[PDB]
């Protein structure tokens, strides 16, 4: 499984 996170962590 791959990491995910809250959207404020990525410019997209």
């Amino acid at each position, epitope marked *: *499984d791959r*990491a995910d*996170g809250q*959207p*404020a962590g990525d*410019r997209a």
Partner: antibody
Framework: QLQQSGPELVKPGASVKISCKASGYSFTGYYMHWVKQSHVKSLEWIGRIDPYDGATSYNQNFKDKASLTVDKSSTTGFMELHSLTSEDSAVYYC??????????????WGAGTTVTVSS | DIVMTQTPLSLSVTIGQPASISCKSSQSLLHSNGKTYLNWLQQRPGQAPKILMYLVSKLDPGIPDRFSGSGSETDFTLKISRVEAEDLGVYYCLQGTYYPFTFGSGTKLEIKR
């Protein structure tokens, strides 16, 4: 969970690399983020790294100040700060963005590394 | 970047009385995907910050039920139903909707005795 390296005394203009050793979970399944605490009530998010492929994302305020890397073999994350000034003296935290029941949030933190920039 | 404004910046409460902290964001924290990424954190003296709740009001397991959050869009409130001695410290709101993550300036909670 997360074990950060010890306090640092750094000269102005030099650089410093601090580390965060992860244990007891799947290192490559979770983002590692870094946070700056400059005063008693000031927190700034620096950026994050995906330990699986090393992909990074920076707060624009830190894109030149900080460089994030990982070492997959030793399940350790690193933040290097470049060209330090007194404004870089602070406590720096690493945190894991874990997930509970489909949602993600900072669920594990290291105890902090104190960096003192000084001649 | 989203500006997070907390109210008040310091407050003192008697053990057993309620406490409330307000957070206002410069833009609605409602993401296009439906979720509202508002987080509340507590920092005790000498320790790292710790998540209390995420998505406005969802408590991290192991956080006592006396903590609760509410609000929507641009206005959010953290409440402690009955303050305990161990609740002293600094409280932060954190928005995770708009890159980059931004915290508010912390609110310091002191105990009256």
């Amino acid at each position: 969970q997360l074990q950060q390296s010890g306090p640092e005394l750094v000269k102005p203009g030099a650089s410093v690399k601090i580390s965060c050793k992860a244990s007891g979970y799947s290192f490559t399944g979770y983002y590692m983020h870094w946070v700056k605490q400059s005063h008693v009530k000031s927190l700034e998010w620096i950026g994050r790294i995906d330990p699986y492929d090393g992909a990074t994302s920076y707060n624009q305020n830190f894109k030149d100040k900080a460089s994030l890397t990982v070492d997959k073999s030793s399940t350790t994350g690193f933040m290097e700060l470049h060209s330090l000034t007194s404004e870089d003296s602070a406590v720096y935290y690493c945190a894991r963005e874990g997930h509970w029941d489909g949602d993600w949030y900072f669920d594990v933190w290291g105890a902090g590394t104190t960096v003192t920039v000084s001649s | 970047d989203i500006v997070m404004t907390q109210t008040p910046l310091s407050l003192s409460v008697t053990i057993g009385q309620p406490a409330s902290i307000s957070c206002k964001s410069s833009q609605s924290l409602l993401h296009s995907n439906g979720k509202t990424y508002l987080n509340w954190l507590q920092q005790r003296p000498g320790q790292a910050p710790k998540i209390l709740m995420y998505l406005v009001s969802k408590l991290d397991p192991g956080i006592p039920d006396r903590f609760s959050g509410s609000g929507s869009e641009t206005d959010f409130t953290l409440k402690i139903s009955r303050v305990e001695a161990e609740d002293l410290g600094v409280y932060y709101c954190l928005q995770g909707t708009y890159y980059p993550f931004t915290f508010g300036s912390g609110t310091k909670l002191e105990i009256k005795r």
